[PDB]
Amino acid sequence: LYRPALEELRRQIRSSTTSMTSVPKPLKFLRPHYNKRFAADIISVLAMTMSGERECLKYRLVGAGEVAKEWQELDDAEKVQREPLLTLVKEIVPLLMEIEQVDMLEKDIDENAYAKVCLYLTSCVNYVPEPENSALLRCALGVFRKFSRFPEALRLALMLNDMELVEDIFTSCKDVVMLGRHGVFLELSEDVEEYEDLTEIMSNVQLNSNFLALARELDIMEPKVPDDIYKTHLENNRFGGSGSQVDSARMNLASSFVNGFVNQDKLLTDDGNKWLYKNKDHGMLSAAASLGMILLWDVDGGLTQIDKYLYSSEDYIKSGALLACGIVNSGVRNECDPALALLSDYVLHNSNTMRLGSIFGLGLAYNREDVLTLLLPVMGDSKSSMEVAGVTALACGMIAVGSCNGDVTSTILQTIMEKSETELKDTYARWLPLGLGLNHLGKGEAIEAILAALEVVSEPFRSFANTLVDVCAYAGSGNVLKVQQLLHICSEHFDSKEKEEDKDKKEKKDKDKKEAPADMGAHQGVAVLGIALIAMGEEIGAEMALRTFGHLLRYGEPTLRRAVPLALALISVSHDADPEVSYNSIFAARLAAMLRQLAQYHAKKGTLTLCPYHSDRQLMSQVAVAGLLTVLVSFL
Amino acid sequence: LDNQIQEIKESVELPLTHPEYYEEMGIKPPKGVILYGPPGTGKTLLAKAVANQTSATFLRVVGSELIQKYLGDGPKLVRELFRVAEEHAPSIVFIDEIDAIGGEREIQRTMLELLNQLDGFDSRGDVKVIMATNRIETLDPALIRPGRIDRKIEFPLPDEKTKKRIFQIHTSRMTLADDVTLDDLIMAKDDLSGADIKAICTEAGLMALRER
């Protein structure tokens, strides 16, 4: 008669001593019926481990309604218990999580939001695979759409890259009237896609004229620049001494680094003349663009300061002047026509260098199709200069970063066919996969790594392109199979796919930096020591990172001794000048002096901060790259 | 106490408070003071150094064990603290528990080297050094004439009020019987910086925790 009582006793003893599968059977056959200590005993821990092992055995065995009813019963029971410490992470692996969160989130906001979204977002990007993080983003868009604290939903816009989220947060943030602060980090948080989609839907309505008035340009820098000049007061002894030990036509290049990247004071900017005349061609580009780097504000002043260098008697003064016009702004787009108009030399005239500075500057200013149709004769020209396809692939890539799961269109297919057209100047095969992987950015479920793994299987040039697509195609998730695959392929004889493919470590595990320090420095492949050396410089630089810079700082090759002050300056932007004095003790070549001054003045998942150095990983070449080394936009 | 803390505060914390009397009055005491007290160990001395930690960079160095724990390193760590103190000119250097004199022949040459480096024969006023010990009689007079030229203060017997308040706070949640008095405890102990009565309250609270 009362056989559910015998089933309750049987599951009570089998659950009492030990079992793995026989425990939940009397409950799924029992249909349980009929704040206390007994209820916490048989419900809390016995139903927590019981329903947990039932959801695990049924979740891993088959893939019904009984597990849904029991799972919702445990959900409500643990909502009565009000201790969501282990219950949430236990009920994660059994959408069910959608109705779980929208069913649980009624009164408590900061507990489930801060705690659950904190440890479950960090553990969701660390351990949980990707297809569940989309449910985290949509259901978090729901429960955070019904709740306050919009900037966390703006983080959901950083991870979602959706066009409706910015509209709902602009009408909900428009109703709830800081302002300039959320506009500044609003533009900082948004990528290349949703600000042009934002500028087209807000080109339609704009709802106050203040959405393109405020959030299109001039207002991520209108609060900063005057306040940065007001609240800060820099001394002149750095320009005097550190601005006086420059010589040998290379520390003067480091002085164009100074001029460009120290702009409160504008004394070194207007310290007489002949400073650009005594410099070299690539230093004429660096100094012509330096006055563009000193003018990240004052749009009206940029035209009247760079106008002297426009259409001058020298080719590099006007080409670097148009590069300056591209660096000074990113939403004016009024300097295009005088440089973008002609574009026609077809062999080697000025408009090719003006194509460097103007296509690269416009790439910094920018799915734009007209500029790409103008870029068709650019890649079709195939100039012997490397930076043509360099700033072309990087420009169209920065135009294509953050797209809807990427694309395999005839643009990158065209640059792949024309890439494999001629196998000369392998630097093309080194920087073209940069822009290729830039177009691969933004993917969530793209098969472009297998499409490329089928289409570019060839000599290690386009196989190096293939492993570059492998680098940009693994931004980061729970895919430890690529970590053991990383360890397996790490011992390849080819000494460049180790550099890039192993260099992806700083991008893959960029968040969980606890596992980033490894034994890569203890090997004999000094290039791997360079890999860890570059991978260190992405944090505040704790005593462990500087401890790695203690051993990495002392080396004999000019490539590593030159490469250590770069990441040493990126990792630290009063322990700054002490490693510099250590460099003065190591040296006292020219590259290490120019680069150590570059650190002296460099001291004082956004693609804009990830692209310029990953493209900068090919500095070990001629000074031709140094014309692009000074115009890096990743430096805040 | 503010009296003996304002002079060391303006002494070593000088270039961050009221910058119209260091160069306008023409004082320049770039030598600091030397602290000493029979309890020492940094209880009231650290209570005098806590005011520098308000708005400034602080450096805490207690004891001379890190110099006498190597074969032949010597004053190299002191030179590292002096070069990081040179690069940290707007900071406060606090040296406590100077009991190196109280093998042994190297202590006199690393202490004389500490005197030569602390004087700054080829350096101007850039950083201030604070000296602290338990007994002033064990220290040789070599560290007195070149070292102390500005001001020295004597510290009286320990204060049973502060130690009794610390023991009362640490024994507030604890369970003590009626036969456990405080005067014999605060009287039997001597030369403790407060972390030692905190240590006997940690091993006494854990020892009482062993019985649940």
Side-chain angles (χ1 to χ4, degrees), chain A residues 574-575 577-578, chain B residues 83-84 87-88:
Chain A
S574 296
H575 288 170
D578 196 1
Chain B
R83 66 179 177 88
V84 77
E87 294 293 327
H88 282 86

Side-chain angles (χ1 to χ4, degrees), chain B residues 56-68:
Chain B
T57 301
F58 188 77
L59 183 62
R60 183 180 64 84
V61 175
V62 176
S64 296
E65 185 177 1
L66 51 93
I67 299 296
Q68 294 179 357

Side-chain angles (χ1 to χ4, degrees), chain A residues 549-568:
Chain A
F549 279 100
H551 184 273
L552 267 297
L553 193 143
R554 175 64 180 87
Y555 201 72
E557 288 293 328
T559 61
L560 268 297
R561 187 179 65 246
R562 184 192 68 189
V564 56
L566 192 144
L568 197 273

